[PDB]
Design a protein around this ligand. Structure first.
Ligand SMILES: CC(C)(COP(=O)(O)OP(=O)(O)OC[C@H]1O[C@@H](n2cnc3c(N)ncnc32)[C@H](O)[C@@H]1OP(=O)(O)O)[C@@H](O)C(=O)NCCC(=O)NCCS
Length: 182
């Protein structure tokens, strides 16, 4: 997994840390601003890593952009010194126009899966599921109520395997939604 020039276990005492625009250092140290800089560095690097893996020319996730856009990120640390980071999922509500099965446009504002990444060295070990499930439970949203931003084939296979999400409603934007969404 991905390691950092500082102590991740101390920064993130919980296995899954939930952060929003205020980037609050979790309850216990270095000064608060220094801990926030650590968190920024982690999000910046997670976003970079997710970006390469997706053939992205630019990351969709960074510390500054998460703050400005008021997204929420769930970061999973490694349980296997100084700790390391396994991956993350980034979510947010977006106002969308979405097509239904009747090819009719609909104004909706669902919870969106905006970025999702698990370190390559530890994929297909069930970490993505654990993280996704945690997010669902915290957000109080059902999987079929989600919109997915530009999913990979991997993520589509994932959503089928773990949540029986298979049948999609064809869109012209770059979001995917499932039967059940409406
Ligand atoms: C998508 C991702 C978050 C899944 O997390 P994960 O920790 O690998 O997932 P889990 O181990 O909980 O679930 C594994 C399931 O995901 C799917 N999956 C994961 N890696 C896969 C691969 N290389 N090929 C095909 N399916 C894959 C499969 O359904 C797999 O089940 P299987 O092993 O029974 O085939 C992770 O693979 C990833 O980071 N991918 C790279 C970037 C990306 O595409 N994600 C962003 C979506 S746009």
């Amino acid at each position: 997994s991905m390691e950092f020039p500082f102590d991740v276990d101390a920064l993130f005492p919980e296995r899954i840390t939930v952060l929003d625009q205020h980037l609050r250092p979790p309850a216990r140290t270095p000064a608060r601003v220094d801990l926030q800089q650590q968190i920024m560095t982690i999000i910046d690097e997670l976003g970079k890593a997710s970006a390469k893996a997706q053939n992205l020319s630019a990351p969709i996730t960074s510390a500054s952009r998460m703050q400005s856009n008021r997204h929420v990120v769930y970061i999973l640390k490694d349980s296997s010194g100084k700790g390391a980071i396994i991956g993350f999922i980034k979510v947010g509500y977006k106002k969308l126009f979405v097509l239904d099965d009747r090819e009719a446009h609909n104004e909706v504002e669902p919870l969106c899966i905006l970025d999702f990444y698990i370190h390559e060295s530890v994929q297909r070990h069930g970490h993505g599921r654990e993280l996704f499930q945690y997010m669902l439970q915290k957000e109080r949203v059902e999987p079929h109520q989600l919109a997915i931003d530009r999913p990979s084939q991997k993520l589509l296979k994932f959503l089928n395997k773990h949540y029986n999400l298979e049948t999609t409603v064809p869109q012209v934007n770059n979001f995917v939604i499932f039967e059940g969404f409406f």
